[PDB]
Amino acid sequence: SGDVNNDLSKGFVDLKVYRVPDLSRPSFNEVVGHKKFDETASKGDTFGP
């Protein structure tokens, strides 16, 4: 979305990534509605260990 803002018929794909702190695995309700997706990911971003 940070590419196009002048045309309302271009379509886009926005990826907001939340990095789980440890190697833990929150299931779905410990993340969605509770955690905040502030970091932005895109095509090329290298992810953690």
How does this model look, in words?
With 49 residues, the protein is mainly beta. The chain contains no helices and two strands. The protein has strands at 15-17, 39-41. Strands 1-2 form a two-stranded antiparallel ribbon. The chain is elongated. Belongs to the glycosyl hydrolase 38 family. It comes from Schizosaccharomyces pombe (strain 972 / ATCC 24843) (Fission yeast). This is Alpha-mannosidase.
Features:
part of a larger assembly, 1 chains, 49 residues, mainly beta, two-stranded antiparallel sheet, 2 strands, hydrolase
Order of helices and strands: EE
In DSSP terms (H or I, runs of 4 or more residues), the helix count works out at: 0
Radius of gyration from CA coordinates = 14 Å
Helix content: under 10%
Report how far apart the termini are.
28 Å
Structural class: mainly beta
Number of strands: 2
Shape: elongated
Largest sheet: 2 strands, antiparallel
Spatial order of strands in the largest sheet: 1-2
Task: Estimate what percentage of residues fall within beta strands.
Answer: 5-15%
Protein name: Alpha-mannosidase
Family: Belongs to the glycosyl hydrolase 38 family.
Subcellular location: Cytoplasm; Vacuole
Organism: Schizosaccharomyces pombe (strain 972 / ATCC 24843) (Fission yeast)
